Paper text:
The crystal structure of the complete [name] protein was solved by SAD in three space groups, P212121 (2.35 Å resolution), P21 (2.5 Å) and C2 (2.6 Å), in which either a monomer (C2) or four intertwined head-to-tail monomers (P21 and P212121) are present in the asymmetric unit. The [name] monomer shows the archetypal, multidomain adaptor topology, with the MP, β-barrel, and lipoyl domains in linear arrangement (coloured orange, yellow and green, respectively). However, the expected final α-hairpin domain is completely absent, confirming what was predicted from sequence analysis, leaving only a nine residue loop (Pro106 to Leu114, blue in Fig. 1B) linking the two halves of the lipoyl domain. Density for this loop is visible only in the C2 monomer where it is stabilised by the loop of a neighbouring monomer in the crystal lattice, but high B-factors here and poorly defined density for the P212121 or P21 monomers indicate the small loop is highly flexible. In both the data-based assembly model of AcrAB-TolC and the in vitro co-crystal structure of an adaptor-transporter (CusBA) subcomplex tripartite pump assembly is facilitated by the flexibility of the adaptor’s serially-linked domains, which was confirmed by MD analysis of the closely related MexA. This ‘hinge’ flexibility at the inter-domain linkers is also evident in the [name] variant space groups which show movement of the lipoyl domain, relative to the other domains.
Numbering used by the authors: 43 to 317
């Protein structure tokens, strides 16, 4: 007793990656709005979301109709072949030839569009890896690669368009028209000691961590350099080796050489990338 207790980490070398948090939409390179030829009322829908349609195929029907006439017309036809990606009108609604009824296009030319601000663009290059996230779980995250950076800077919004091509499998669930968080990876620090942000401790205008010595059951305060910090993880360099025991809870009470009580040893952070 009179000793300060702890939980430590079995520290490991790994990869900490820098990334930009962006927002983007799932688009397709080949799509088109279905516009009617006549003004009038929707009498039937012969399409469902998901349906493949031939160019010129009848998709919706209208009133025959007017007083009148003399051009009694005209069904709605698909402007190109493809899949129905959206339906924007229902039975009963009236439509002019500038009324978007639905969208058709290809499901195999998926593309993520995102507008990177002027101040962040510099660190981006074609071939960069990215994670497209629509949710928190494994089925809701997909891999991608930067395909194309526009040379044009929209002087209005101060942004450059970056396009990303998704890769891997599960891409079925990456649905066209969806919103996505994008994590665009600009760099990776390989072969660095990774530790939770908490273990790092500012005392006297300098950062340290606490290495545990199992034989003497006490700690040593070592000066450390933070190389990079992200996701509440820290990459560092120092006289910390693989498998050293560094404290990840209870550093408020400690000084250099203070005795301790090791309650449990947490397993190290993944040797592979944070993202």
């Amino acid at each position: 007793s009179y000793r300060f207790p702890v939980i430590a980490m079995k520290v490991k070398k790994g990869i900490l990656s820098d990334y930009l948090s962006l927002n983007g939409d799932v688009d397709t390179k080949v799509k088109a709005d279905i516009f009617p030829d006549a003004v009038g009322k929707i009498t039937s829908l012969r399409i469902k979301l998901g349906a493949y349609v031939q160019k010129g195929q009848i998709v919706a029907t209208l009133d025959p109709s007017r007083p009148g006439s003399v051009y009694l017309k005209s069904p709605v036809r698909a402007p190109i072949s493809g899949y129905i990606l959206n339906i924007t009108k229902k039975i009963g609604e009236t439509v002019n030839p500038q009324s978007n009824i639905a969208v058709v296009g290809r499901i195999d030319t998926k593309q993520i569009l995102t507008y990177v601000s002027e101040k962040y663009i510099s660190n981006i290059k074609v071939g960069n890896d990215a994670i497209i996230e629509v949710g928190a779980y494994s089925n809701e995250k997909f891999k991608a690669k930067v395909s194309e950076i526009s040379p044009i800077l929209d002087s209005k919004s101060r942004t450059i368009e970056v396009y990303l091509t998704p890769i891997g499998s599960n891409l079925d669930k990456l649905i066209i028209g969806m919103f996505s968080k994008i994590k665009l990876i600009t760099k990776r620090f390989k072969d660095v000691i990774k530790i939770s942000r908490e273990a790092v401790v500012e005392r006297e205008g300098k950062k340290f961590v606490f290495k545990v010595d199992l034989e003497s059951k006490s700690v040593q305060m070592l000066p450390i350099t933070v190389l990079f910090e992200i996701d509440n993880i820290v990459a560092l360099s120092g006289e910390v080796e693989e498998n050293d025991l560094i404290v990840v809870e209870g550093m408020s009470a400690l000084s250099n050489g203070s005795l301790i009580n090791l309650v449990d040893t947490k397993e190290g952070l993944s040797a592979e990338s944070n993202i």
